[PDB]
Design a protein around this ligand. Structure first.
Ligand code: YHH
Length: 238
């Protein structure tokens, strides 16, 4: 991700077939002539999409131009959470399924994985960050405390941001309960709250390298959303 001061991010297309698949997804969703009620509703939960971009002197170098969801925040606290029971797609080989399950073999039980967080601490005027190893180290026993950390500013638990997150996830969950034309593997929710405030939160869907047409509910995604909501709910009892 490259932040731009014009309030957008440029995401470089990943290698084939992932990058091309993601470009195609955004193009389908944000088709100018799209009248599909499901896809029109979905746009509410994605970053705004400004089309494909490439440097003036480099047509080969493909990016997606996306809304920077963190632009309107003073001290944005950011967490990326992968959603679902399977991070591998319907066209994965045995080798690839094994790779994907191994990266975080706990995916099926929990239904989500924290990919990283960046949390502003008020009393130090500074950021702590966690990388992919943090979330991959979380278990059933420690997932609640693991997620809680995102909402801890170093004096209070931000239950306002927790409750707001639940309410925004609930809307995404309602979208998933009302569609059976897309299944999402290895896709994420991006959480952003204001670290500096009260209950002002972004929750957006990102990372669409493994979205496929379907004829079923995305039961894996739903399981993950619900577990994540359940965890956030229990954090409110702290
Ligand atoms: C972690 C982080 C840090 C910072 C600083 C910004 C963002 C960020 O803010 N708005 C965003 C909109 C879309 C995306 C998605 C392209 C990314 C993907 O698909 O992996 C990332 C975005 C994220």
């Amino acid at each position: 991700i490259l932040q731009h001061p014009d309030g957008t991010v440029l995401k470089q297309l990943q290698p084939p077939p992932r990058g091309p698949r993601e470009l195609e997804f955004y193009n389908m969703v944000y088709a100018a002539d799209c009248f599909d009620g499901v896809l029109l509703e979905l746009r509410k939960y994605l970053p705004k999409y400004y089309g494909i971009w490439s440097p003036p002197t480099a047509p080969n170098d493909l990016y997606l131009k996306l809304e920077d969801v963190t632009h309107k925040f003073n001290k944005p606290c950011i967490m990326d959470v992968k959603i679902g029971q399977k991070s591998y797609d319907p066209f994965a080989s045995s080798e690839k399924i094994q790779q994907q399950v191994s990266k975080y073999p706990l995916m099926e039980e929990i239904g989500f994985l924290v990919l990283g967080m960046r949390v502003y601490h008020v009393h130090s005027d500074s950021y702590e960050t966690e990388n992919q190893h943090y979330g991959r180290s979380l278990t059933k026993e420690t997932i609640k405390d693991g997620v809680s950390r995102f909402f801890h500013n170093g004096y209070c638990l931000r239950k306002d941001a927790v409750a707001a997150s639940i309410q925004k996830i609930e809307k995404i969950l309602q979208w998933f309960e009302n569609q059976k034309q897309l299944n999402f593997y290895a896709s994420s929710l991006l959480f952003v709250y204001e670290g500096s405030s009260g209950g002002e939160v972004e929750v957006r869907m990102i990372d669409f390298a493994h979205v496929f047409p379907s004829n079923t509910i995305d039961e894996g995604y739903v399981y993950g959303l619900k577990h994540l909501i359940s965890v956030l709910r229990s954090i409110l009892d702290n």
